[PDB]
């Protein structure tokens, strides 16, 4: 299926994925298309920060859903 | 099977692939041989920009076929 | 299962893994979450430097276990 | 099984591999241990340059064998 990933600016990425794909898989896809490494990526859906090892279906992300992509900064 | 990947300059990458490999697989092989990240890679065949999720058979890429590899720049 | 990875400062990383995951798999997950390339990671558990090709179960790393992550130099 | 990788300097890398691993698999393991990207790696055994897609058993590389790791430079 197809999903969308948008930065807050509105720049849209289109990804082909499977419901069983993990959030990490999506992150690697964003890296493939955008050069943005996974550790710099925070993905948000339904107001929730998406966890790497959990799947798209787990979060009920469906055909043509849109995730937001947010930059993840260093802490300590 | 074997395929070729050429920059517009003529420089040739020879790859060992399967028809079920995806375009992303091929990009990864190109990274493996040339150090060029997938996100900087645009592959072209039959006039068409090749999509990461599609397979070589999907685009009728057969043995000894040549893809063109082109630099993808930052935009929006 | 869940495991923790901590630097010597105490900074804590939480990872979802399988007992059949290799030590290299774990380093790949650390890279995923922290951007530290596997070659720069040394992982230690039970005093032992952890070998890449061995599994978590090979080392009897169980759930809620903690590993130490240390910087590996040239 | 265990194999050894050495530069022409003696520095010895010890790898755990399977006879069905590809040469690319080995380069990936070298990257994991040393940070050397696969494209910068030329591996040599029995006087030949090893091909990414071929397997360790394909080259008759057995346990406790030693491969040579050689720098690959930019060319054309
Ligand atoms: Cl290849
Ligand atoms: Cl647990
Ligand atoms: Cl190894």
Swiss-Prot record, chain C:
Tell me which residues are marked as the site Essential for function.
Answer: 68
Consult the record and explain the modifications the protein receives after translation.
Phosphorylated at Ser-65 by PINK1 during mitophagy. Phosphorylated ubiquitin specifically binds and activates parkin (PRKN), triggering mitophagy. Phosphorylation does not affect E1-mediated E2 charging of ubiquitin but affects discharging of E2 enzymes to form polyubiquitin chains. It also affects deubiquitination by deubiquitinase enzymes such as USP30. Mono-ADP-ribosylated at the C-terminus by PARP9, a component of the PPAR9-DTX3L complex. ADP-ribosylation requires processing by E1 and E2 enzymes and prevents ubiquitin conjugation to substrates such as histones.
* Localization terms from the record: Cytoplasm; Nucleus
Per UniProt, location of the Glycyl lysine isopeptide (Lys-Gly) (interchain with G-Cter in ubiquitin) cross-link in this chain: 6, 11, 27, 29, 33, 48, 63
Q: Consequence of mutating residue 72 to G?
A: No effect on ADP-ribosylation
Q: What outcome is documented for mutating residue 74 to K in this protein?
A: No effect on ADP-ribosylation
**Effect on the protein of changing residue 74 to G:** No effect on ADP-ribosylation
Q: Which residues carry this modification: Phosphoserine?
A: 65
Annotated Ubiquitin-like domain ranges read 1-74
Indicate the annotated site residue(s) for Interacts with activating enzyme: 54, 72
Job description of the protein? Exists either covalently attached to another protein, or free (unanchored). When covalently bound, it is conjugated to target proteins via an isopeptide bond either as a monomer (monoubiquitin), a polymer linked via different Lys residues of the ubiquitin (polyubiquitin chains) or a linear polymer linked via the initiator Met of the ubiquitin (linear polyubiquitin chains).
Task: Please state what the protein is called.
Answer: Ubiquitin
Organism taxonomic ancestry:
Eukaryota, Metazoa, Chordata, Craniata, Vertebrata
């Amino acid at each position: 299926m197809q999903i969308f990933v948008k930065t807050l600016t509105g720049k849209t990425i289109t990804l082909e994925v499977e419901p069983s794909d993990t959030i990490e898989n999506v992150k690697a896809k964003i890296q493939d298309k955008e050069g943005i490494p996974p550790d710099q990526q925070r993905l948000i859906f339904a107001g929730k920060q998406l966890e790497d090892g959990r799947t798209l279906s787990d979060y009920n992300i469906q055909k043509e859903s849109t995730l937001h992509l947010v930059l993840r900064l260093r802490g300590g």
